[PDB]
Amino acid sequence: ASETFEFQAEITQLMSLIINTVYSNKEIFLRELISNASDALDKIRYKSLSDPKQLETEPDLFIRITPKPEQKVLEIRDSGIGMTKAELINNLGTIAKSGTKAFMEALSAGADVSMIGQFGVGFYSLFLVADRVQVISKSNDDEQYIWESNAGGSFTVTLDEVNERIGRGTILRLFLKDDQLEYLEEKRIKEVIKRHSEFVAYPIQLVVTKEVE
């Protein structure tokens, strides 16, 4: 059984705006997700300073990107702090965010969509290239859960009994729009990373599937 929740009014507005925008530099979405991953990694790392055992659930700190072409899916994973069920509901939708309205007004004035991250709502830039997203997360303090949204007014949270076990961390599973399948390509992904995420303190791994020769 999955519980359904409504997004705070302004967040629904932002998503509708983003998923329908004409913007030409949509690649910045990956920069934002990598940045968020790094911040979650910083949090578990900082937390481990006074409680090292917090790391035992997943000793390695990394960001991993996995293209799943057959499903037109792009996964961005990190072994950061992760989110409990309550945090998913809180952080991803029900609580108002300081910059949602301000960012939208900035866009109306001509601001570059690339500024989204500075308004603290970069997560939603994922809708530039995807029309559906599943956030799979495992915090040391809770079971693994699935938060899902299609840019509509509500989202779902479900106990995870269908995905690979995450030691600790979060997986953003993006279901790419048909005209944005280029982000499934190793070449494209690498250039976006080098260009926007040169200064990341964690290893960024890319999972590539090749047919044997």
Ligand X SMILES: COC(=O)c1c(O)cc(O)c(Cl)c1CCC(=O)Nc1cc(O)c(OC)cc1O
Cβ neighbors of 193 (< 8 A, separation 6 or more) are 30, 34, 204
Q: Which of residues 91-120 bind ligand X (CB under 6 A)?
A: 91
Give the sheet arrangement for strand 154-159, strand by strand: 2-6, 154-159, 145-149, 130-138, 169-176, 73-78, 63-68, 204-206
3 state SS of 204: strand
Q: Which of residues 49-78 bind ligand X (CB under 6 A)?
A: 78
Told to check if 40 binds ligand X by CB under 6 A, we report yes
Length of the chain, in residues: 213
Beta-bridge partner residues of 176: 130
Min CB(116)–ligand X separation in Å? 12
**Cβ(43)–Cβ(55) under 8 Å?**
no
Min CB(76)–ligand X separation in Å? 7
Q: Which of 18, 63, 65, 83 binds ligand X (CB under 6 A)?
A: 83
Q: Which of 33, 61, 73, 116 binds ligand X (CB under 6 A)?
A: 33
Q: Which of 12, 36, 140, 144 binds ligand X (CB under 6 A)?
A: 36
Cβ neighbors of 86 (< 8 A, separation 6 or more) are 142
Told to check if 197 binds ligand X by CB under 6 A, we report no
Query: What does 112-146 look like in DSSP terms, one character per residue?
Result: -GGGGGGGT-GGGGGGGTEEEEEEEEE-TTS--EE
120 labeled binding residue? yes
Whose structure tokens read 């866009």?
107
- Among the residues of 3-120, which ranges form H helices? 9-19, 28-47, 85-89, 100-108
Told to check if 172 binds ligand X by CB under 6 A, we report yes
Min CB(108)–ligand X separation in Å? 24
Min CB(211)–ligand X separation in Å? 31
Rounded-to-5 percentages of helix, strand, coil across the chain: 40, 25, 35
Min CB(205)–ligand X separation in Å? 15
47 labeled binding residue? no
Told to check if 90 binds ligand X by CB under 6 A, we report yes
Q: Which residue is nearest to ligand X, using beta carbons? A: 40
Q: Which of residues 111-170 bind ligand X (CB under 6 A)?
A: 123, 170
Interacting residue ranges for ligand X, rule: CB under 6 A: 33, 36-37, 40, 78, 80-83, 90-91, 123, 170, 172
- Binding residues, as ranges, are 32, 36, 78, 83, 91, 97-99, 118-123, 170
